[PDB]
Amino acid sequence: GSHMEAVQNRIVEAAERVPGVRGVIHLRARYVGQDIWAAMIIGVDPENTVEQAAEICEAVQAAVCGKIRRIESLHVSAEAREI
Amino acid sequence: GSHMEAVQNRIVEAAERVPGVRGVIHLRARYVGQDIWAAMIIGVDPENTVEQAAEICEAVQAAVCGKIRRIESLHVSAEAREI
């Protein structure tokens, strides 16, 4: 913690910058040693296709893991969300 | 178990009969006392909208809980799936 809060901040921020993300609805992050393992849910446009939602999830996973190096496991899922 | 396997059978079967379900991809079911609590993932058409996928999930939840009375908690989520 404290230092976790700073990491979580960077995860939320990294995710929100990815096209199609309507907020991070949920983020659970934990230290396994010096590595982070995490799970998040993002908001998506309810009219996107399931495919697009899966694409946005992958894109988040890559942007986030691309920016926070200590992350060794991130699962990203999606939920319909209004703006 | 044994009797769990019979319940799980009925959950899979109930789910597959619901329009838009492309198989049950995952089912975790457990006894809390004499009640079942469960979580499942269904296949959906990747071109459905996220909204439709959420609708199909609710419809599964209701059909299944409507048919297996001992179920007191069922969460249903969806994943893109090819036929």
Residue numbers in the entry:
A (entry chain A), B (entry chain A): 211 to 293
What do the authors of the reporting publication say about this deposited model?
One group of metal ion efflux transporters that regulates metal ion homeostasis and can be found in all domains of life is the Cation Diffusion Facilitator (CDF) protein family. One of the most highly conserved and abundant integral MM proteins is the CDF transporter MamM. MamM was recently proposed to function as a magnetosome-directed iron transporter required for iron biomineralization since its deletion abolished magnetite biomineralization and mutation of residues within the conserved TMD metal-binding site resulted in alterations of magnetite crystal size, morphology and even mineral phase.
Although no cation binding was detected for the resulting double mutant, D249A + H264A, by ITC in vitro it still produced magnetite particles in vivo. In addition the D249A+H264A double mutant showed a drastically delayed formation of magnetite during iron induction experiments. Therefore, the reduced magnetite formation reflects decreased MamM activities caused by less (e.g. MamM D249A) and/or shorter (e.g. MamM D249A+H264A) TMD activation events. (ii) All mutants exhibited an apo-MamM CTD-like behavior along the MD simulations, and (iii) an absence of structural differences was observed.
